[model samples]
Target chain A: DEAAELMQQVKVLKLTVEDLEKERDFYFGKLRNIELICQENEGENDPVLQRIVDILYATDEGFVIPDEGG
Target chain B: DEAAELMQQVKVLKLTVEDLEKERDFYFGKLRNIELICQENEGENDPVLQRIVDILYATDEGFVIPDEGG
Candidate 1:
């Protein structure tokens, strides 16, 4: 069923997103920053650092919005 | 207890911080690139683009992560 696929897709996406967020939170805590705060970090020019922050922001945004067609 | 064990693991390492940021950037870039491509084409898939847009810009307010026991 299309609904089934959609629901399954959503579930997978949700799980993937949640896992990412939990990891993000874990790092954020270790680094002493919230995910949101990490995005706003001052020396974010370090690509690695910026990437880490960006991932959390992006994944968070991704889950909130569903794919358009397929 | 299993719950206690799980909770302890939550205190351990986290992963996927970087991948998420890259994916987010990819989606954002895709959105922009799609706009540029569509501007040139003049007729593009709306629903698909809309979904992509929705995902690219969705909110992350309601997400909650349950920490299982260590």
Candidate 2:
């Protein structure tokens, strides 16, 4: 839920919230990459900030599921 | 399981949904600092969202691995 939570925060934090058109464009331009990854991975296992880390820096691949029960 | 199925869709979306006061507050209040970067990077190659755009945006310098295509 933090993923969605952060999106909400972004909408609120900007100095002056833009009109719906601008806001939609901004998120559309910016969140394109996020939306892609979210769709590609079948929307599973996007740990809060980890998704943020991936998009900000070019990297290898999708999340490697940590072995359950070490 | 959809991160436990979207945390049950944030307890079925907010309008007059209480009784889970402690649960809601637990996530809503506990978020901070996280608010700083989620917007800072614009949620591009955010791993699950994209894949870490570049080192300039990256706080630490690491994750240099040999090419998989190598």
Candidate 3:
């Protein structure tokens, strides 16, 4: 019945969430290291370089999900 | 049978996805911002700065999303 369909969709949604979380963390690590690089290299305090670090410290997003056979 | 239960779960699942999407984009926004800064600052050729830009640009790689519309 509809319950079966719902259950299947539930599984798909669960997988989607997990995949998104993985991608989110993947980008996070990349940004974190860049921030550290600037900090250690004495570029963090410079006006232009500081802006780069500030953005890293602030906003975020770079994500997408793949499609499964429909 | 229990489509209602599964429907309930799906509702929660969608919400979770929405939150994750925003968080993911938040980070990407920063990457985009940093990329622009590096280019404008004439750091495009700087070995170290180029590395940061490369990482941001390559964020789309290794992602398996097909029909990547965005």
Q: What is the DockQ of each candidate?
A: 0.04, 0.04, 0.36
Question: In terms of TM-score, how similar is model 2 to the real structure?
Answer: 0.21
Best by TM-score: 3
Q: Which stretches of candidate 2 lie over 4 Å from their true place?
A: A1-20, A43-70, B1-70
Model 3, CA-based lDDT: 0.71
Clashing pairs in 3: A59-B26, A60-B25, A60-B26, A60-B27, A60-B28, A61-B24, A61-B25, A61-B26, A61-B27, A61-B28
lDDT of 1 by residue, A1-70 (tens): 5354444444555566676675444434432332333355437532223443444344324455455321
Best by lDDT: 3
Over 4 Å off in model 3, which ranges?
A: A43-47, A59-70, B43-47, B57-70
DockQ, cand. 2: 0.04
What is the Å distance of residue B6 in model 3 from its true position? Answer: 1.3
Q: Worst lDDT window (10 residues) for model 1 chain A?
A: A29-38
Q: What is the lDDT of residue B17 in candidate 3?
A: 80
Residue A67 lDDT in model 2?
A: 64
Cα RMSD (angstroms) for every candidate in the order listed: 17.6, 19.9, 8.0
- Predicted complex 3: CAPRI docking category: acceptable
- Clashes counted in candidate 2 amount to 25
Better of 2 and 3 by lDDT: 3
